C-alpha cells in the first residue's frame, strides 16, 4: 500500500470518532479504518472492493457529464436532435425518448455481462485479480506507482460519488447543480 | 448450532447441508417428519413447473399460435378460452409423463425403493449437461434458485392478475392501484 | 432477603438478579408460577412494540406520507382499517410471529434467552460490556415507553390533541 | 323425454319458481331496503333463481310434481345424474379403504400395533394418504400377486 | 414442541374430530361456492 | 393462413414520462403527490 501507516493500512483511522474494526485489516487499498458498522466482518470484501471501485468510476464520469451539460458544451449535432436545454433530467428525458440512453444502456450492459461479470465470478472463486483491474491502461501511466495511482483512484472515485449525490440534489432543490 | 438462514433457531438437524440450497431453512420442522429425499423432489417439481409457468405467462402475452382459440394475452382467460379437448390432452400427457419418467414408482411408498433413484433426479438430461462434475454442483445449486424464484414470482403473477384483471406485462405498463 | 426496589417486599424466589432491569420486583408472584424466560420474551415484546409506537406516534404527528392523508395517529388506525393497510400490517406482523411461535417453544427448551433474536445489523452489541449495559438500557426504555404510550394515547382520547400540540 | 318431460319448460317448474320467490319477496316487503335484512332476502331470491335457471339448462327432466327427476339406468345423456358422481365417490372410497388397509399393516408390523392404532404415526399415516391415488392399480396388483386375498386355510373359523 | 403433547395431539380422538372438522369444512366450502349441485354439470 | 401471431406489448409505452401510465409512473406520482 502507498503510505502504509500513513495514508492507509492498519492503525490508521480517518475518523478517530470510530474505532478502526478489527475487520479492516490493511490488505486493501482504500482501507483508512472507517467501518462503524463493522459490514466487513461478513460482507465479501473482494466484491465489496470491486463495487466501490465501480460506483466511484461511474460517479467521475458522471460528474463530468453532468458538468459539460451544465455549461453546455455539446457535440457537433447532439443540439439539434435532443434540444438546447442545460437541465441535466430533462436531457436525460429526451435522450431516452430518442434512444440515446438505451444504446448506452445496451453496450453498458453488455460489457458488464461479458467483462464485469465473468471477472468479478473469477476474482471471487479466487483468480487473484486486484479488484477493479480490467487490464485497461492503454497510454500506460499506470505503470511508475501502480500503487499510488490505485489509492488515487479510489479518493477520486469516493469523492466524485458524494459530489454527483450532491449536485443531482442540489440541481432537485435549486435548479442548479452547484447548488451555491 | 444455530440456522445460518434463521440465526435465532436451532439448525435443522435433518439439514445436514449437502442439498444444494441448503442454508438451514425449515423453521417449521417439515424435514424432521418428512424424508427430505421426498420434500426434495417436490421442491424440484415445484420449481421446474413454475419455471414454465413463468416464462409461459410472459411469453403467450406476445406470441400465440395460430387461431381465435389460442388468441388471448390474458393467461386467465387462455385457460378457458384454449380448445378443452387439447387441455384434457395436456393433462393425459403429464400423467403418463409422471409415471414413465418415476417407472412406476409414483408414490410415498415406492418412489425411492432403488438406491440409484436419487431425489429430482429423472433420468431427463438429453444434451447431457449435467455430466461435468465441476459445473454440476453450480447448475443444481442454480436449479434449486430457480425453481424457488419461479414458484414466488408465478404465485404473486397469478394473483396480480386477479386482482388487476390485466396481463403482468399489460399490467406493469398501465398500472391501477387497487381500489375496492 | 426482601427486595432491591421494594425494601419491606421479600425478594422473589426465581428473580436473582441475574436478568437486566431486575430489581425484585414482583409483588404478585407471577414468576411463582410462570416462566421467568416466557414472561421476559412477553415483556420485550411489549416494551418493543411500544416503543416503536411512541417514535411512530411522534414521527407521524410532524410528518406523515405524501400519498397518504394527514391523520392524527390514534385517527390513522380506524382509517386504515377499513383502507386496507391495517390489514396488511396484520398479515406480515403475523407472518413473523408464526417464526416467533418457534422461537418461543426454542426458548421453553432452553436453546434461547428471552428476546434475544440474534438482531444485529449494524452490529453494535459485539463488546460485552457494552451489550449489558444496552440490554439494561434496553429493558429501562421498553418498560419507561409501555407507560409512555398508554400515556399519549389517553391524553389524545380525553384532549383530543395530538401530544406536541398539548405541550404547548 | 323418456317418460317425462324437460324442466327447462315444464309450467310445474315454473310455479315451484314463481311460489318460491313470492314467499321471499313478502318476507322482504317487511324489511328496511338496505338493512341486513333485506339483503340476505334479495340474495336468498338471486340464489333460487340461479338454482331454477341451471337446473333448467342442465338438462334434468321434471315431472307432474315440477321437481326434477333422475334417470339412473346407465343411459349416457343423464351420466352425470348418477354414474359420473357414483365413480367420484367410489374412487374416494377406495383411496380410503386402501390406504386405512396400508396403515394397518403397517401397524402390524411394528412394536405395538396396538399403540399405533391408538396413537397413530401421522407421518406414515399421510403417507399412506398420498399413495391412495392410485389405489385401482395398487389394488389390482395386490391382489394379482396374492398379497389381498388370503388363503382358507389361515383364517379362523368357527366349527360346523 | 414436546413430544409427548404431539402423541397427544395424536391419540385416535383428537385426529378423528381434526380430520373430520376438515372435511365437514371442505364439503362446506364447496356448497358455499358451488352450491344447488344435483348432479356432474354435462 | 395458420401464421404464429406476434403482439407487440409494448406499444406506445415508456418505463416513465410516457403516454401510459407504468408502475415507475405510479410510484413518482405518489411520492410527488400532493394531501
Ligand atoms: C441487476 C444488476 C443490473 C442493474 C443495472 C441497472 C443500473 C441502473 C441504471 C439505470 C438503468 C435504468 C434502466 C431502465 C431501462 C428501461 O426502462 O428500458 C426502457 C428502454 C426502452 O427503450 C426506450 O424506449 C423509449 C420508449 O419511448 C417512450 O418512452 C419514453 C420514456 O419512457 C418517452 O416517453 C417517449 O416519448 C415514449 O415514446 C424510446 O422510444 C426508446 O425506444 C428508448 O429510449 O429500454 C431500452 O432502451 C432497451 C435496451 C435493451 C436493454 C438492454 C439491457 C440488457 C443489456 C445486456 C446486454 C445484452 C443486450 C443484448
Ligand atoms: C447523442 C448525441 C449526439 C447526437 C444526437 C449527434 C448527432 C449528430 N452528429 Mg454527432 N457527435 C456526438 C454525439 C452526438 N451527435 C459526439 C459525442 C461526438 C464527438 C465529439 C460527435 C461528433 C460529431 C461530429 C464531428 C459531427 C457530428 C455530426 C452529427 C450530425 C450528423 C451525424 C450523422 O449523420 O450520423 C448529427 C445531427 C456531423 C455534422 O454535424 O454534420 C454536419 C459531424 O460533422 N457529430
Ligand atoms: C444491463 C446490464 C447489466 C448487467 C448484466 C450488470 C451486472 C452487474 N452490475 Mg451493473 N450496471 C449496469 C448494467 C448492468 N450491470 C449499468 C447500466 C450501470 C450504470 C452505468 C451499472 C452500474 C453498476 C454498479 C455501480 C455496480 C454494478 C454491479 C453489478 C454486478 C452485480 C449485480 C449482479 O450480479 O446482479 C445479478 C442479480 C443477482 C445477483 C440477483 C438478483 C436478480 C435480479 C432481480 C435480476 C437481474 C436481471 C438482469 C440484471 C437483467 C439483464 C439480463 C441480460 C444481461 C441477459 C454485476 C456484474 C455492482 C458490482 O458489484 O459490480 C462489481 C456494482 O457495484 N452495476
Ligand atoms: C482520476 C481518476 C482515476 C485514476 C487516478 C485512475 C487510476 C487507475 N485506473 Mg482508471 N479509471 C477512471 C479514473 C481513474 N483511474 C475512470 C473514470 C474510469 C472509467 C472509465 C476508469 C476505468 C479504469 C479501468 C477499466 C482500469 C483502470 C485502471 C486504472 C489503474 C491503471 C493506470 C491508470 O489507468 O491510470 C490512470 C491515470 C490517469 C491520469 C487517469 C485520469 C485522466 C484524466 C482525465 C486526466 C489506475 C489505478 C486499470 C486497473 O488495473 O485498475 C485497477 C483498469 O483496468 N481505470
Ligand atoms: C396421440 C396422438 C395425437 C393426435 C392424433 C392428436 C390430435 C389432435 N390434437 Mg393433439 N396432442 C397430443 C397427441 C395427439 N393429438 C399430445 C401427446 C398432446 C400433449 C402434449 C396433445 C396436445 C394437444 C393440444 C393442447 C391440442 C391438441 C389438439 C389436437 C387436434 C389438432 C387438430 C389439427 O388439425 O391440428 C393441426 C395443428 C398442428 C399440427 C400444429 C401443431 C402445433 C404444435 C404445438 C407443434 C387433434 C384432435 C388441439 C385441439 O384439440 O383443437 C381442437 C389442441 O388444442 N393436442
Ligand atoms: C337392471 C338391469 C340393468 C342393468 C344392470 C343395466 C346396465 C347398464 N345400462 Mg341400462 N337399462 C335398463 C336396465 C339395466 N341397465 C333398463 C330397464 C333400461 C330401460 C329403461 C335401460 C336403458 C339403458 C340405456 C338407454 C343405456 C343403458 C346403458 C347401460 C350400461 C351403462 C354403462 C356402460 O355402458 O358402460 C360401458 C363402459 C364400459 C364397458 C367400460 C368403460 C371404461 C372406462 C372407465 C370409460 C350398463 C351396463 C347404456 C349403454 O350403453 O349400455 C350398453 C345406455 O345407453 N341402459
Ligand atoms: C354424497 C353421497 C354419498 C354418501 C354420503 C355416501 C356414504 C356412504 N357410502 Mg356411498 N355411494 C354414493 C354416494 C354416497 N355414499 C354413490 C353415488 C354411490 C354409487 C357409486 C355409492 C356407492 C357405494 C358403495 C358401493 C358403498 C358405499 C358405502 C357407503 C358408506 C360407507 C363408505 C365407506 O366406508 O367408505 C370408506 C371406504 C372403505 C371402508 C373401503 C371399502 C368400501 C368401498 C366403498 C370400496 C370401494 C372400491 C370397491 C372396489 C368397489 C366395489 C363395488 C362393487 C362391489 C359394487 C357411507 C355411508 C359402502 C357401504 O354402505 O358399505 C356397507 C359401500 O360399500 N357407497
Ligand atoms: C385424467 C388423468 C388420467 C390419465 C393419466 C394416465 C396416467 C396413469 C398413471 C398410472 C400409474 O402411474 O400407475 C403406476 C403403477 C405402479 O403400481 C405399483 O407397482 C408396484 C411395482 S412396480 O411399480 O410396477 O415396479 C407394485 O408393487 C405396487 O403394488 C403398485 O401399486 O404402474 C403399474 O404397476 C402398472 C401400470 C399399468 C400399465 C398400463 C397402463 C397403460 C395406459
Ligand atoms: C434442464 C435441461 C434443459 C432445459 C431447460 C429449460 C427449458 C429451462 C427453462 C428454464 C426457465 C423457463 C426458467 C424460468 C425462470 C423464471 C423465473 C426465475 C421467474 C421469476 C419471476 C419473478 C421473480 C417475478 C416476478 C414478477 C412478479 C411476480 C410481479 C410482476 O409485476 C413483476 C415480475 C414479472 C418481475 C434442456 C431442454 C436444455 C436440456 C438439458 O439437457 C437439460
Ligand atoms: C382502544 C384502541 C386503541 C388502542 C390502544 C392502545 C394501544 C391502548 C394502550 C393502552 C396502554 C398502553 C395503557 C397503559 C397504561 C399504563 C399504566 C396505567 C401504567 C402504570 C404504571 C405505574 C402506576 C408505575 C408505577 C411505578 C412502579 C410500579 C414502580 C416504579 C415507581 C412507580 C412510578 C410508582 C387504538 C389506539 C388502536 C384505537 C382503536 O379505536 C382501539
Ligand atoms: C390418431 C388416432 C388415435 C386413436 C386413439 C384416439 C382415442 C380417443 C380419441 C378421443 C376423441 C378425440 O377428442 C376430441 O374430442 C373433442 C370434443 O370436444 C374435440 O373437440 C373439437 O374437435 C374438432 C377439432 O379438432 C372440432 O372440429 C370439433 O368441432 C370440436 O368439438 C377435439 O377435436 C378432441 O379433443
Given at each position: 500500500?502507498?503510505?502504509?501507516?500513513?495514508?492507509?493500512?492498519?492503525?490508521?483511522?480517518?475518523?478517530?470518532i470510530?474505532?478502526?474494526?478489527?475487520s479492516?485489516?490493511?490488505?486493501?487499498?482504500?482501507?483508512?479504518?472507517?467501518?462503524?458498522?463493522?459490514?466487513?466482518?461478513?460482507?465479501?470484501?473482494?466484491?465489496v472492493?470491486?463495487?466501490?471501485?465501480?460506483?466511484?468510476?461511474?460517479?467521475?464520469?458522471?460528474?463530468?457529464?453532468?458538468?459539460?451539460?451544465?455549461?453546455?458544451?455539446?457535440?457537433?449535432?447532439?443540439?439539434?436532435?435532443?434540444?438546447?436545454?442545460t437541465?441535466?433530467?430533462?436531457?436525460?428525458?429526451?435522450?431516452?425518448?430518442?434512444?440515446?440512453?438505451?444504446?448506452?444502456?445496451?453496450?453498458?450492459?453488455?460489457?458488464?455481462?461479458?467483462?464485469?461479470?465473468?471477472?468479478?465470478?473469477?476474482?471471487?472463486?479466487?483468480?487473484?485479480?486486484?479488484?477493479?483491474?480490467?487490464?485497461?491502461?492503454?497510454?500506460?501511466?499506470?505503470?511508475?506507482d501502480?500503487?499510488?495511482?490505485?489509492?488515487?483512484?479510489?479518493?477520486?472515485?469516493?469523492?466524485?460519488?458524494?459530489?454527483?449525490?450532491?449536485?443531482?440534489?442540489?440541481?432537485?432543490?435549486?435548479?442548479?447543480?452547484?447548488?451555491? | 448450532?444455530?440456522?445460518?438462514?434463521?440465526?435465532?433457531?436451532?439448525?435443522?438437524?435433518?439439514?445436514?447441508?449437502?442439498?444444494?440450497?441448503?442454508?438451514?431453512?425449515?423453521?417449521?420442522?417439515?424435514?424432521?417428519?418428512?424424508?427430505?429425499?421426498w420434500?426434495?423432489?417436490?421442491?424440484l417439481?415445484?420449481?421446474?413447473?413454475?419455471?414454465?409457468?413463468?416464462?409461459?405467462?410472459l411469453?403467450?402475452?406476445?406470441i400465440?399460435?395460430?387461431?381465435?382459440?389460442?388468441?388471448?394475452?390474458?393467461?386467465?382467460?387462455?385457460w378457458?378460452?384454449?380448445?378443452?379437448?387439447?387441455?384434457?390432452?395436456?393433462?393425459?400427457?403429464?400423467?403418463?409423463?409422471?409415471?414413465?419418467?418415476?417407472?412406476?414408482?409414483?408414490?410415498?411408498?415406492?418412489?425411492?425403493?432403488?438406491?440409484?433413484?436419487?431425489?429430482?433426479?429423472?433420468?431427463?438430461?438429453?444434451?447431457?449437461?449435467?455430466?461435468?462434475?465441476?459445473?454440476?454442483?453450480?447448475?443444481?445449486?442454480?436449479?434449486?434458485?430457480?425453481g424457488?424464484?419461479?414458484?414466488?414470482?408465478?404465485?404473486?403473477?397469478?394473483?396480480?392478475?386477479i386482482?388487476?384483471?390485466?396481463?403482468?406485462?399489460?399490467?406493469?405498463?398501465?398500472?391501477?392501484?387497487?381500489?375496492? | 432477603?426482601?427486595?432491591?426496589?421494594?425494601?419491606?417486599?421479600?425478594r422473589?424466589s426465581?428473580?436473582?438478579?441475574?436478568?437486566?432491569?431486575?430489581?425484585?420486583?414482583?409483588?404478585?408472584?407471577?414468576?411463582?408460577?410462570?416462566?421467568?424466560?416466557?414472561?421476559?420474551?412477553?415483556?420485550?415484546?411489549?416494551?418493543?412494540?411500544?416503543?416503536?409506537?411512541?417514535?411512530?406516534?411522534?414521527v407521524?404527528?410532524?410528518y406523515?406520507?405524501?400519498?397518504?392523508?394527514?391523520?392524527?395517529?390514534?385517527?390513522?388506525?380506524?382509517?386504515?382499517?377499513?383502507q386496507?393497510?391495517?390489514?396488511?400490517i396484520?398479515?406480515?406482523?403475523?407472518?413473523?410471529?408464526?417464526?416467533?411461535?418457534?422461537?418461543?417453544?426454542?426458548?421453553?427448551?432452553?436453546?434461547?434467552?428471552?428476546?434475544?433474536?440474534?438482531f444485529?445489523?449494524?452490529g453494535?452489541?459485539?463488546?460485552?460490556?457494552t451489550?449489558?449495559?444496552?440490554?439494561?438500557?434496553?429493558?429501562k426504555?421498553?418498560?419507561?415507553?409501555?407507560?409512555?404510550?398508554?400515556?399519549?394515547?389517553?391524553?389524545?382520547?380525553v384532549?383530543?390533541?395530538?401530544?406536541?400540540?398539548?405541550?404547548? | 323425454?323418456?317418460?317425462?318431460?324437460?324442466?327447462?319448460?315444464?309450467?310445474?317448474?315454473?310455479?315451484?319458481?314463481?311460489?318460491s320467490?313470492?314467499?321471499?319477496?313478502?318476507?322482504?316487503?317487511?324489511?328496511?331496503?338496505?338493512?341486513?335484512p333485506?339483503?340476505?332476502?334479495?340474495?336468498?331470491?338471486?340464489?333460487?333463481?340461479?338454482?331454477?335457471?341451471?337446473?333448467?339448462?342442465?338438462?334434468?327432466?321434471?315431472?307432474?310434481?315440477?321437481?326434477?327427476?333422475?334417470?339412473?339406468?346407465?343411459?349416457?345423456?343423464?351420466?352425470?345424474?348418477?354414474?359420473?358422481?357414483?365413480?367420484?365417490?367410489?374412487?374416494?372410497?377406495?383411496?380410503?379403504?386402501?390406504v386405512?388397509?396400508?396403515?394397518?399393516?403397517?401397524?402390524?408390523?411394528?412394536?405395538?400395533?396396538?399403540?399405533?392404532?391408538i396413537?397413530?404415526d401421522?407421518?406414515?399415516?399421510?403417507?399412506?394418504?398420498?399413495?391412495?391415488?392410485?389405489?385401482?392399480?395398487?389394488?389390482?396388483?395386490?391382489?394379482?400377486?396374492?398379497?389381498?386375498?388370503?388363503?382358507?386355510?389361515?383364517?379362523?373359523?368357527?366349527?360346523? | 414442541?414436546?413430544?409427548?403433547?404431539?402423541?397427544?395431539?395424536?391419540?385416535?380422538?383428537?385426529?378423528?374430530?381434526?380430520?373430520?372438522?376438515?372435511?365437514?369444512?371442505?364439503?362446506?366450502?364447496?356448497?358455499?361456492?358451488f352450491?344447488?349441485m344435483?348432479?356432474?354439470?354435462? | 393462413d395458420?401464421?404464429?401471431?406476434?403482439?407487440?406489448?409494448?406499444?406506445?409505452?415508456?418505463?416513465?414520462?410516457?403516454?401510459?401510465?407504468?408502475?415507475?409512473?405510479?410510484?413518482?406520482?405518489?411520492?410527488?403527490?400532493?394531501?
Open positions: 500500500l502507498y503510505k502504509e501507516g500513513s495514508l492507509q493500512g492498519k492503525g490508521v483511522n480517518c475518523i478517530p470510530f474505532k478502526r474494526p478489527d479492516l485489516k490493511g490488505d486493501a487499498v482504500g482501507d483508512m479504518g472507517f467501518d462503524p458498522f463493522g459490514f466487513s466482518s461478513w460482507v465479501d470484501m473482494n466484491y472492493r470491486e463495487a466501490e471501485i465501480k460506483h466511484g468510476r461511474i460517479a467521475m464520469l458522471a460528474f463530468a457529464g453532468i458538468v459539460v451539460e451544465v455549461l453546455g458544451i455539446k457535440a457537433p449535432g447532439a443540439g439539434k436532435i435532443l434540444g438546447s436545454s437541465d441535466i433530467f430533462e436531457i436525460h428525458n429526451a435522450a431516452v425518448e430518442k434512444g440515446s440512453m438505451g444504446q448506452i444502456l445496451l453496450w453498458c450492459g453488455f460489457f458488464e455481462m461479458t467483462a464485469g461479470l465473468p471477472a468479478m465470478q473469477q476474482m471471487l472463486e479466487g483468480s487473484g485479480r486486484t479488484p477493479g483491474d480490467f487490464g485497461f491502461d492503454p497510454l500506460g501511466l499506470g505503470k511508475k501502480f500503487a499510488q495511482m490505485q489509492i488515487k483512484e479510489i479518493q477520486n472515485g469516493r469523492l466524485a460519488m458524494l459530489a454527483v449525490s450532491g449536485m443531482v440534489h442540489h440541481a432537485l432543490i435549486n435548479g442548479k447543480v452547484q447548488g451555491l | 448450532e444455530k440456522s445460518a438462514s434463521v440465526p435465532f433457531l436451532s439448525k435443522p438437524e435433518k439439514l445436514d447441508g449437502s442439498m444444494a440450497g441448503d442454508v438451514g431453512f425449515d423453521p417449521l420442522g417439515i424435514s424432521y417428519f418428512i424424508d427430505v429425499k420434500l426434495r423432489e417436490a421442491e417439481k415445484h420449481g421446474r413447473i413454475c419455471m414454465l409457468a413463468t416464462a409461459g405467462i411469453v403467450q402475452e406476445v400465440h399460435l395460430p387461431g381465435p382459440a389460442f388468441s388471448s394475452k390474458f393467461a386467465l382467460d387462455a378457458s378460452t384454449a380448445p378443452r379437448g387439447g387441455m384434457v390432452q395436456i393433462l393425459i400427457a403429464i400423467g403418463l409423463i409422471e409415471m414413465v419418467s418415476n417407472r412406476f414408482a409414483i408414490t410415498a411408498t415406492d418412489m425411492f425403493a432403488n438406491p440409484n433413484r436419487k431425489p429430482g433426479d429423472l433420468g431427463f438430461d438429453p444434451l447431457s449437461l449435467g455430466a461435468n462434475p465441476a459445473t454440476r454442483a453450480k447448475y443444481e445449486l442454480s436449479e434449486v434458485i430457480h424457488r424464484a419461479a414458484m414466488m414470482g408465478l404465485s404473486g403473477m397469478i394473483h396480480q392478475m386482482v388487476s384483471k390485466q396481463p403482468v406485462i399489460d399490467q406493469l405498463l398501465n398500472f391501477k392501484p387497487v381500489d375496492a | 432477603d426482601f427486595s432491591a426496589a421494594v425494601p419491606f417486599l421479600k422473589p426465581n428473580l436473582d438478579g441475574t436478568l437486566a432491569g431486575d430489581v425484585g420486583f414482583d409483588p404478585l408472584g407471577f414468576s411463582d408460577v410462570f416462566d421467568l424466560r416466557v414472561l421476559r420474551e412477553a415483556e420485550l415484546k411489549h416494551g418493543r412494540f411500544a416503543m416503536l409506537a411512541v417514535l411512530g406516534f411522534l407521524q404527528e410532524v406523515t406520507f405524501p400519498f397518504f392523508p394527514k391523520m392524527a395517529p390514534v385517527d390513522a388506525h380506524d382509517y386504515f382499517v377499513t386496507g393497510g391495517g390489514s396488511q396484520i398479515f406480515w406482523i403475523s407472518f413473523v410471529e408464526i417464526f416467533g411461535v418457534v422461537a418461543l417453544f426454542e426458548l421453553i427448551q432452553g436453546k434461547r434467552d428471552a428476546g434475544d433474536f440474534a444485529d445489523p449494524l453494535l452489541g459485539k463488546d460485552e460490556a451489550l449489558a449495559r444496552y440490554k439494561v438500557a434496553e429493558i426504555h421498553a418498560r419507561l415507553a409501555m407507560i409512555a404510550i398508554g400515556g399519549f394515547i389517553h391524553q389524545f382520547w384532549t383530543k390533541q395530538t401530544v406536541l400540540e398539548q405541550l404547548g | 323425454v323418456a317418460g317425462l318431460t324437460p324442466c327447462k319448460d315444464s309450467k310445474d317448474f315454473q310455479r315451484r319458481l314463481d311460489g320467490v313470492k314467499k321471499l319477496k313478502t318476507r322482504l316487503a317487511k324489511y328496511e331496503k338496505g338493512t341486513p333485506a339483503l340476505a332476502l334479495e340474495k336468498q331470491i338471486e340464489r333460487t333463481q340461479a338454482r331454477f335457471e341451471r337446473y333448467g339448462k342442465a338438462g334434468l327432466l321434471c315431472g307432474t310434481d315440477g321437481l326434477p327427476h333422475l334417470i339412473t339406468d346407465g343411459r349416457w345423456s343423464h351420466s352425470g345424474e348418477f354414474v359420473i358422481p357414483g365413480l367420484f365417490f367410489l374412487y374416494i372410497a377406495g383411496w380410503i379403504g386402501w386405512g388397509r396400508s396403515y394397518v399393516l403397517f401397524a402390524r408390523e411394528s412394536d405395538k400395533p396396538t399403540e399405533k392404532e396413537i397413530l401421522v407421518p406414515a399415516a399421510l403417507s399412506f394418504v398420498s399413495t391412495g391415488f392410485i389405489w385401482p392399480v395398487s389394488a389390482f396388483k395386490e391382489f394379482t400377486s396374492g398379497n389381498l386375498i388370503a388363503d382358507e386355510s389361515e383364517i379362523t373359523v368357527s366349527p360346523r | 414442541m414436546d413430544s409427548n403433547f404431539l402423541k397427544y395431539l395424536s391419540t385416535a380422538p383428537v385426529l378423528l374430530t381434526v380430520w373430520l372438522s376438515f372435511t365437514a369444512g371442505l364439503v362446506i366450502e364447496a356448497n358455499r361456492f352450491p344447488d344435483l348432479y356432474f354439470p354435462m | 395458420s401464421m404464429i401471431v406476434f403482439e407487440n406489448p409494448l406499444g406506445k409505452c415508456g418505463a416513465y414520462a410516457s403516454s401510459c401510465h407504468t408502475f415507475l409512473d405510479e410510484m413518482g406520482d405518489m411520492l410527488k403527490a400532493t394531501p
